[PDB]
Design a protein around this ligand. Structure first.
Ligand SMILES: CCCCCCCCCCCCCCCCCC(=O)OC[C@H](COP(=O)([O-])OCC(O)COP(=O)([O-])OC[C@@H](COC(=O)CCCCCCCCCCCCCCCCC)OC(=O)CCCCCCCCCCCCCCCCC)OC(=O)CCCCCCCCCCCCCCCCC
Ligand SMILES: CCCCCCCCCCCCCCCCCC(=O)OC[C@H](COP(=O)([O-])OCC[N+](C)(C)C)OC(=O)CCCCCCCCCCCCCCCCC
Ligand SMILES: CCCCCCCCCCCCCCCCCC(=O)OC[C@H](COP(=O)(O)OCCN)OC(=O)CCCCCCCCCCCCCCCCC
Ligand code: SF4
Ligand code: SF4
Ligand code: SF4
Ligand code: SF4
Ligand code: FES
Ligand SMILES: [K+]
Ligand SMILES: [Zn+2]
Lengths: 263, 96, 51, 95, 209, 154, 176, 115, 129, 115
């Protein structure tokens, strides 16, 4: 066939042309770190957390946006790859606020877990952090944008999945802020999903605010009945009480999204 | 402060009070219901709003390592005060 | 620590040996004096349990 | 420590040792209950440079067991050299 | 090897134990199924359960083994396997100042040969395995429950046994006796999901699917 | 010892009582003073040392008759050897930190957890999820005050 | 290195044999034991006059729990639930919601003082020093229900023992 | 041989008055049992190797104290006791025949960890 | 070969009578064999690699004293991990439980091109970056 | 696939010999159990309880499962004979302090959600 051969840490794998370095590592069970890449949105390549060394190449490549060339040996655990993940994680946490105890994302946060799996264990940052002013985008999504890492997943989702071009980046540089610029409400039938695709606690559920923590919930896999689509959901419960509703991936029904009524 | 429902049972700071028909009130017969009278919501509101001449101010809660993690608060918004998410202290920008 | 593949720092190792041997005196005082108490001798229990 | 010299002699004589030198009751020789604040040192990883975690990561240097034999001329060997014989204490060989 | 926070690696012992592992396998090919040495220099001999007595007797009596002390005997319950149980022997050699692990397996219904003839220490350890796991040991002097209550039903250390059991005790005044009734908890044990969804150790990754 | 060691009443209750032979002690899984009371020269603090026990000097008491009396002498003598070790620990105590300088295993100082983003993440995760231990099984044993105390951790 | 504890041979010279004969007949070594206990009779007893004299403790003592406040009077707890997650005995139960002013605060904070093992992990895990184990060790009760503390009991403990808790922390926070 | 030790130091282990004679008997007896083991069995080759090495030292060290150091097996009575344990094992190894191929391979994932 | 003098037993493995479990918890239960779904709040996929066996949820009520969540179900916290679906089904049938099996859901491979973000004549051109 | 090591019995005929032997041992021991433990039940009640316990496991057809039941049952008899059990343990077979749970659908429907 047209399949080309690439190596992931020396293991051969046959991938279709156009496949990305990140997708080639999935074929062998390896998951590359990521904050901006989502398998159902456009490729951004702006978090630089997926940098992976390619053998016999002096430069690291964005694994989420780099197509695989034939005969490449992707080194997912070399010193260069691991030193690229520590630097990027160090830059993500430089201005991030010490909000973990009061942040609803604590315990199920990709920034926490990838900081403890791919980053360093301390900080050499001896300055003052940045502070951003919060924004109101409706009664459903609570915004604390000091925690935003400018991953643009909410921008791509709102424009592509929801077909609403209301979110964007204003300013430039370290002062780049995600928002609607003007006082506007991102009220859409798929508006609640920006909570999930936000890796940090910048976007969180307002009804669910402060009620529970991820580890103490019990997950019941059920079906949504608010409409005839039959969206698959997870009913999170704690001590005999329903706490929140979450999407459950089903490729042929609802992807990994659910409408606001369901959520 | 501490309120009292019509039955005379003191309402806690969490809004808890047994209804008239609730049998669980019997546990207080011959004893007392322990209610803390120093409502935090009331006390924190008594603190004055501090004026600071900068866009961004930081709060560690007072005492350094005896306080809370140091967070940074934005004061650009002129229609409200900036509030610390740990201790509740409020800050404002000097004449903007 | 063997499974983690880490090593405790030298000062911690000495404290653990220090209190490991203070803990040995706690055990042997209990063992010897309660052994004597069962056999009948009762006063050594009181002298060494103040230590 | 308040015992009279007569009783001190009597208790010393009966036990056969100078008890007053090693009293089992503590007096002002103990440390003060209030002590000055400490300033604890930092570990060897409290550096600002040449301190990447991939160079000091113990957990990531653990490997799965090395399989010697699997079912999927030579000299006899013991698990280790025979244990060396112990030597009698030079401090107090016989109690 | 100068790194303060990383455990030093002893490669001399790793070599010696690997050589003795082959030594055992060459002498007992009839039972030895697998041999391995961990990164912390511990040797494991995996055997067919029919070789419990031959393998242990060799290690106890052989001149170059002299494993004359049974440090411990225990079982591990892994429900995913056909032989869910895994009988583990830890032996200590005072002559050669070394330790070895012998591992076998059995299911709920297959007996395992008793080790009492080799090690008298195994008398009480095998009662514990039967008591807490339900593994029967053949030719045991007196096989009984050793840790659970009299008339206790079930083997607690099985993974499918609930943490709080099925019965609880209280004193009933009507019958002037201590009675057993189905378990009810004023506060249920809260189950936490703590596993991170991000792989921690690439070196131990399994082949896909 | 003035009350027990040379007391004839005490010696009657202990001498030639509970004799265990050296070969039976090993085959029954005995350890510690039970082995040493029968003359077996074995102490894990000297043969398989851990921590810093190879940097301290002490003697291992050894019995000769394997009876309750000899094992009593070993315990009284070990208490003297523990004072010997403590004297060396009090003098050779070094400076430095007291937990491994690896915040992915041991929590950071509270002053660091309230100042550094990385430390707060690690304090949060260590006290909620804990640190992951790589797969494997180990049998670790020490010379506990009353024998070989071991853990088979999987 | 090792040493024999009971490997000795008694000298068989006539004087030594007679010395042992006197010991056997005249009970010499049994009178040393009498002398040893006689000396203790004249030593000052080590007994303290409780409850008027209390055994010494240290600032690190782990006693009765208390929920602390800031100098402003605001509660320190922000319902992070780290103490609930690390509690070895699962003795802590927490529920929280947005307060009327928007703050993150608990509507429930229960410690079952009969499940608690008084280990101090909860105060090691708290990021804001909200939950502490105080120096009180005299709180025995006449009923099992009085040891099931709720947020109201724990706040009163904080308002009760703050003058002492704050001083003990001051004397120990540089070791934490 | 020199002076005869008064005690072995191990409870229940009597002092042997003819150690060199007793060790020749046992080591020789071991080599006789190993003959009935198949010539290519690893137990026969290894046990014969070590047994001859021990037997060689016994026949070249008339002094007991010096012989203990060369054998490195503790007191001479411990070495005699271990020669008797090697003889019982050799007799039992004949009835077990562990040199035969593996009785049965385990299920495919019987020794996989983690589950 | 073996010399243990084996015997032939031809019948489905069943240990319900020797496990010690009460009758009411072998016949009225329903064990759900499934691969846990990804926690949508994260991107990691390491929790969706092993099969699990959880039982049906029973009643939880409110403790009249402290309001805690009380239960009378001994198997409310019982989760078993299996390497394969057939391993899970074998364990369920061995212990007599009734089981429902949910087939694994794997994300489908997707064609991701960064060059499609800037397309000459397609709707995949992005208005923002 | 079907070859397995037996515990004691090679077939059901051999396993049922042990079951009947165990029933005799229990049948003869009830009169003493009601006597030594001073149970307030009669021999008829106790011997009917033994019969009930045996009948619960009458549908078994696996000789290995039957052997475990006899082995477990023999251990129960040993504790009763030697008075390792107390009056509480013997009387735990009768559930005297448990209110009889409903069996029909309507009764279970009213009182709760369990099947
Ligand atoms: C038989 C011998 C009886 C002698 C009388 C006891 C005596 O006076 O001892 C003093 C004195 C105290 O000895 P100590 O143990 O060193 O005193 C400890 C502190 O110094 C003691 O210092 P302190 O400051 O603690 O003293 C305080 C103490 C005052 O201490 C004393 O006064 C000693 C007790 C006498 C009163 O106050 C009291 O408690 C007085 C009440 C004592 C209890 C009542 C007993 C009275 C005698 C029997 C009453 C029944 C009839 O004993 C001696 O020095 C030698 C006594 C033998 C002399 C030969 C007699 C023939
Ligand atoms: C309170 C007021 C005072 C009470 C009376 C004084 C206390 C008297 C008893 C304690 C004596 C102190 C201990 C002591 O010195 O003994 C050590 C000494 C030392 O004992 P030894 O065991 O070390 O050896 C001494 C003898 N050689 C060396 C030969 C083995 O013990 C004696 O000498 C006691 C001898 C007295 C023998 C009397 C027995 C017959 C009694 C007849 C009835 C009258
Ligand atoms: C007894 C009188 C004292 C005799 C004495 O001590 O003289 C020394 C003499 C040699 O002593 P020695 O070489 O050490 O060994 C004994 C060898 N027969 O010792 C001897 O040879 C004496 C040999 C033993 C004969 C006496 C044995 C019977 C017990 C006698 C009791 C002596 C104590 C009685 C109290 C005397 C004081 C009043
Ligand atoms: S987004 Fe994650 S790292 Fe940032 S404060 Fe929230 S939980 Fe902590
Ligand atoms: S708000 Fe969340 S999803 Fe949007 S850019 Fe920031 S981190 Fe990404
Ligand atoms: S001291 Fe320990 S057991 Fe007690 S509440 Fe705190 S963490 Fe839980
Ligand atoms: S750890 Fe402290 S802040 Fe967090 S819930 Fe417990 S008491 Fe509150
Ligand atoms: S995941 Fe590739 S740069 Fe963000
Ligand atoms: K989010
Ligand atoms: Zn603050």
């Amino acid at each position: 066939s047209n399949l080309i051969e690439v190596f992931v840490d020396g293991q051969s794998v046959m991938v279709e042309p156009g496949t990305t370095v990140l997708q080639a590592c999935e074929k062998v069970g390896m998951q590359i770190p990521r904050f901006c890449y989502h398998e159902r949105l456009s490729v951004a390549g702006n978090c630089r957390m997926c940098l992976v060394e390619i053998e016999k190449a002096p430069k690291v490549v964005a694994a989420c946006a780099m197509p695989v060339m034939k005969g490449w040996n992707i080194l997912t655990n070399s010193e260069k790859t691991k030193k690229a993940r520590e630097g990027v994680m160090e830059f993500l946490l430089a201005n991030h606020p010490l909000d973990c105890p009061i942040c609803d994302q604590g315990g199920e946060c990709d920034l926490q877990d990838q900081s403890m799996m791919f980053g360093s264990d301390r900080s050499r940052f001896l300055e003052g952090k940045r502070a951003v002013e919060d924004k109101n985008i409706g009664p459903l999504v609570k915004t604390i944008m000091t925690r935003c890492i400018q991953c643009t997943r909410c921008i791509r989702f709102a424009s592509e999945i929801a077909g609403v071009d209301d979110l964007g980046t204003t300013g430039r540089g370290n002062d780049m802020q995600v928002g609607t610029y003007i006082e506007k409400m991102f009220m859409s039938e798929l508006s609640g999903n920006i909570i999930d695709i936000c890796p940090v606690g910048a976007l969180t559920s307002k009804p669910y605010a402060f009620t529970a923590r991820p580890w103490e919930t019990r997950k019941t896999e059920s079906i949504d009945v608010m409409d005839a689509v039959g969206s698959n959901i997870v009913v999170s419960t704690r001590t005999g009480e329903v706490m929140r509703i979450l999407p459950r991936m089903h490729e042929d029904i609802n992807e990994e999204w659910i409408s606001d009524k369901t959520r | 402060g501490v309120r009292t429902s019509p039955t005379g049972e003191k309402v806690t700071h969490t809004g808890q009070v047994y209804d008239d028909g609730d049998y669980r009130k019997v546990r207080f017969v011959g004893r007392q219901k322990e209610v803390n009278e120093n409502f935090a919501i009331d006390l924190i509101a008594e603190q004055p709003v501090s004026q600071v001449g900068s866009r961004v101010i930081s709060c560690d809660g007072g005492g350094g390592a005896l306080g809370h993690p140091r967070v940074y608060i934005n004061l650009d918004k002129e229609t409200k005060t900036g509030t610390c998410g740990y201790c509740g202290l409020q800050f404002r920008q000097q004449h903007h | 620590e063997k499974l983690l593949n880490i090593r405790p720092p030298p000062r911690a190792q000495w404290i653990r040996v220090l209190f490991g041997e203070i803990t040995r005196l706690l055990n042997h005082i209990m063992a010897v004096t309660t052994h004597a108490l069962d056999i009948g001798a009762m006063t050594p229990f009181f002298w060494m349990f103040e230590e | 420590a308040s015992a009279t010299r007569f009783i001190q002699w009597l208790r010393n004589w009966a036990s056969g040792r100078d008890l007053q030198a090693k009293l089992q009751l503590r007096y002002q020789e103990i440390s003060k209950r209030t002590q000055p604040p400490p300033k604890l040192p930092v570990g060897p990883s409290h550096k600002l440079s040449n301190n990447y975690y991939c160079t000091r990561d113990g957990r990531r240097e653990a490997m799965p067991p090395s399989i010697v034999m699997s079912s999927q001329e030579k000299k006899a060997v013991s698990p280790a050299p025979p244990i060396k014989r112990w030597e009698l204490s030079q401090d107090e060989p016989y109690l | 090897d100068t790194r303060p926070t990383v455990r030093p690696r002893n490669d001399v012992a790793h070599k010696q134990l690997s050589a003795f592992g082959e030594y055992v396998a060459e002498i007992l090919p009839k039972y030895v199924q697998q041999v391995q040495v961990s990164c912390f220099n511990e040797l494991e001999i995996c055997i067919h359960p029919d070789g419990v007595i031959p393998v242990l007797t060799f290690l106890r009596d052989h001149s170059n083994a002299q494993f004359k002390s049974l440090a411990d005997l225990t079982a591990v319950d892994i429900p995913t396997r056909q032989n869910r149980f895994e009988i583990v022997y830890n032996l200590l050699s005072l002559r050669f100042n070394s330790r070895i692990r012998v591992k076998t397996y059995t299911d709920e219904l297959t007996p395992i040969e008793s080790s009492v003839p080799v090690y008298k220490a195994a008398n009480w350890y095998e009662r514990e395995i039967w008591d807490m796991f339900g593994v029967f040991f053949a030719n045991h002097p007196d096989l009984r429950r050793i840790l659970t209550d009299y008339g206790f039903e079930g083997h607690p250390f099985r993974k499918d046994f609930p943490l709080s059991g099925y019965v609880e005790l209280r004193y009933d005044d009507e019958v002037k006796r201590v009675v057993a009734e189905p378990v009810e908890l004023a506060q249920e044990f809260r189950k936490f999901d703590l596993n991170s969804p991000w792989e921690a150790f690439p070196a131990y990754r399994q082949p896909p699917e | 010892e003035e009350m027990l060691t040379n007391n004839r009443i005490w010696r009657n209750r202990t001498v030639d009582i509970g004799i265990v032979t050296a070969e039976d002690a090993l085959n029954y899984g005995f350890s510690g003073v039970m082995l040493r009371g029968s003359g077996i020269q074995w102490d894990l603090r000297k043969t398989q040392p851990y921590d810093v026990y190879d940097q301290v000097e002490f003697d291992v008491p050894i019995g000769s008759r394997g009876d309750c009396y000899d094992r009593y002498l070993c315990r009284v003598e070990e208490m003297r050897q523990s004072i010997r070790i403590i004297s060396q620990c009090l003098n050779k105590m070094p400076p430095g930190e007291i937990k491994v300088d690896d915040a992915k295993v041991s929590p950071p100082k509270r002053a660091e957890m309230k100042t550094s983003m990385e430390s707060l993440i690690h304090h949060f995760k260590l006290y909620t999820e804990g640190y992951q231990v790589p797969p494997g099984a180990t049998y670790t044993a020490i010379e506990a005050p009353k024998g070989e105390f071991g853990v088979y951790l999987v | 290195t090792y040493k024999y504890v009971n490997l000795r041979e008694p000298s068989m010279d006539m004087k030594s044999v007679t010395d042992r004969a006197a010991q056997t007949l005249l009970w010499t070594e049994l009178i040393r034991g009498l002398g040893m206990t006689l000396s203790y009779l004249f030593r000052e007893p080590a007994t303290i006059n409780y409850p008027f004299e209390k055994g010494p403790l240290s600032p690190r003592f782990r006693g009765e729990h208390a929920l602390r406040r800031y100098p402003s009077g605001e509660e320190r707890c922000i319902a992070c639930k780290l103490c609930e997650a690390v509690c070895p005995a699962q003795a802590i139960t927490i529920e929280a919601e947005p307060r009327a002013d928007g703050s993150r605060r608990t509507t429930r904070y229960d410690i079952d003082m009969t499940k608690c093992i008084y280990c101090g992990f909860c105060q090691e895990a708290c990021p804001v020093d909200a939950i502490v184990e105080g120096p009180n060790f005299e709180f025995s009760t006449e009923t099992h229900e009085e040891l099931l503390y709720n947020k109201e009991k724990l706040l009163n403990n904080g308002d009760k023992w703050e003058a002492e808790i704050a001083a003990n922390i001051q004397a120990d926070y540089l070791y934490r | 041989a020199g002076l005869l030790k008064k005690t072995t130091g191990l409870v229940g282990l009597a002092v042997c008055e003819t150690p060199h004679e007793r060790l020749k008997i046992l080591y020789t007896k071991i080599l006789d049992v190993l003959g009935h083991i198949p010539k290519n069995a690893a137990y026969r080759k290894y046990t014969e190797q070590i047994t001859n090495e021990k037997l060689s030292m016994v026949k070249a060290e008339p002094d007991v104290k010096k012989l203990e150091e060369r054998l490195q097996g503790g007191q001479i009575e411990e070495v005699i006791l271990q020669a008797e344990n090697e003889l019982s094992l050799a007799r039992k190894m004949i009835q077990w025949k562990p040199w035969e191929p593996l009785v049965e391979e385990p299920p495919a994932s019987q020794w996989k960890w983690p589950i | 070969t073996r010399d243990t003098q084996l015997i032939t037993v031809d019948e489905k493995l069943d240990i319900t009578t020797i496990t010690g479990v009460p009758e009411e918890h072998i016949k009225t239960r329903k064990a759900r064999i499934f691969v846990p779904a990804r926690n949508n709040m994260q991107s990691g996929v390491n929790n969706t690699k092993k099969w699990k066996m959880e039982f049906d949820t029973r009643e939880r009520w409110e403790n009249p004293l402290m309001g805690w969540a009380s239960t009378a179900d001994p198997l409310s916290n019982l989760v078993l991990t299996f390497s394969t679906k057939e391993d899970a089904v074998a364990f369920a049938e061995k212990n007599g439980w009734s089981y429902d099996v949910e087939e694994r859901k794997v994300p489908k491979p997707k064609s991701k091109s960064y060059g499609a973000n800037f397309s000459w004549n397609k709707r995949t051109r992005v208005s923002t970056k | 696939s079907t070859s397995v090591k037996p515990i004691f019995s090679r077939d059901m005929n051999e396993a049922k010999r042990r079951v009947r032997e165990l029933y005799r041992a229990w049948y003869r021991e009830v009169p003493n159990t009601v006597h030594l433990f001073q149970l307030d039940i009669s021999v008829k009640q106790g011997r009917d309880k033994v019969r009930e316990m045996f009948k619960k496991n009458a549908h078994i057809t696996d000789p290995r499962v039957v052997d475990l039941l006899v082995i477990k049952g023999k251990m129960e008899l040993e504790e009763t004979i030697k008075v390792w059990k107390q009056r509480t343990h013997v009387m735990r077979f009768f559930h005297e302090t448990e209110a009889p749970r409903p069996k029909d659908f309507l009764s279970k429907f009213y009182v709760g959600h369990d099947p």
